[PDB]
Design a binder for this molecule. Structure first.
Ligand SMILES: COC(=O)C[C@H]1C(=O)NCCN1C(C)=O
Length: 291
């Protein structure tokens, strides 16, 4: 799977909000481009002069994420975050010359990402009361990953002493994206756990935080809520469910070739952090079949 790399695998079956610190600092921003940010400005002008209804929006930038020594007390994760924008993304990660910007970042800064926007995405492994995960089909008419399978998520827009509010907006935004797209009531959803962070090598290495969320509704009820919004209530074109039993071997299925990279990230982390039991009971052959 060359189009996805794991930046972080969380311990203890995943991390709650209260165990994560953020450092939001202009030291974590993209570096100005070697020939000037006029190259980003030019791509944006060309785009607005064809699609003048487009808008810029701020985004969180992932710099890095440091896990504490395992088994320790206190905060378990430090997220180093900067700020970027939709416009900076279109002029860097989405650019035809994105591989050249990575090589120049290696040369100039010892960092393949130094000249990349790298907006932080969020995604969920969303489980039902009857032990299915939730999948969405993308429109064949959109620019990114057309007609591919996805999981719920988005790219949160901004607004440890502003740090804790930033972690709160990240956990909040994954629930909000589930309510907006799947049309589920907020009170049917668990507090999320962070499973890890995955990078999309097809989009020049931009990262998504992958979460586990439990719903108290069955798969038949989740479908009813999704469909009852109508075609205008969602960006996706369909919803479907795979038993948690069968997610274990999903990378061996024909479905795998149709999954967008960030959804592959979510399923790998679900299998490693929520699947893959460590104890004698769940590890017994009748409950963990070999092969
Ligand atoms: C229609 O989808 C797009 O690509 C539009 C785009 C935009 O205009 N501004 C920021 C990101 N975005 C949205 C709606 O989130």
């Amino acid at each position: 799977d060359p189009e996805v790399t794991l930046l972080l695998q969380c311990p203890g079956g995943g991390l709650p909000q209260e165990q994560i610190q953020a450092e939001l600092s202009p030291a974590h921003d993209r570096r100005p481009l070697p020939g000037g940010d006029e190259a980003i400005t030019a791509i944006w002008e060309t785009r607005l002069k064809a699609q003048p209804w487009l808008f810029d929006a701020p985004k969180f930038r992932l710099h890095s994420a440091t896990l504490a020594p395992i088994g320790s007390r206190g905060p378990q994760l430090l997220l180093r975050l900067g700020l970027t924008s939709y416009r900076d993304f279109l002029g860097t990660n989405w650019s035809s010359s994105a591989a050249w910007l990575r090589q120049q970042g290696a040369t100039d800064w010892g960092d393949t990402q130094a000249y990349l926007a790298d907006p932080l995405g969020v995604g969920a492994a969303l489980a039902t009361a009857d032990d299915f995960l939730v999948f969405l089909r993308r429109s064949r008419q959109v620019a990114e990953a057309p007609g591919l399978v996805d999981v719920p998520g988005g790219h949160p827009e901004p607004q440890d002493l502003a740090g804790q509010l930033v972690v709160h907006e990240l956990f909040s935004s994954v629930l909000q994206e589930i309510c907006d797209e799947v049309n589920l009531p907020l009170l049917t959803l668990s507090q999320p756990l962070l499973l890890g962070i995955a990078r999309n090598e097809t989009s020049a290495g931009r990262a998504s935080a992958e979460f586990y969320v439990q719903c108290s509704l069955t798969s038949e009820q989740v479908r009813k809520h999704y469909l009852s919004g109508g075609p205008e209530a969602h960006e996706s074109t369909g919803i479907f469910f795979v038993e948690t039993q069968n997610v274990r071997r999903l990378p061996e299925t024909e479905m795998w070739a149709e999954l967008c990279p960030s959804a592959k990230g979510a399923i790998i982390l679900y299998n490693r952090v929520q699947g893959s039991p460590t104890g004698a009971a769940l590890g017994s052959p009748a409950l963990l079949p070999p092969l």
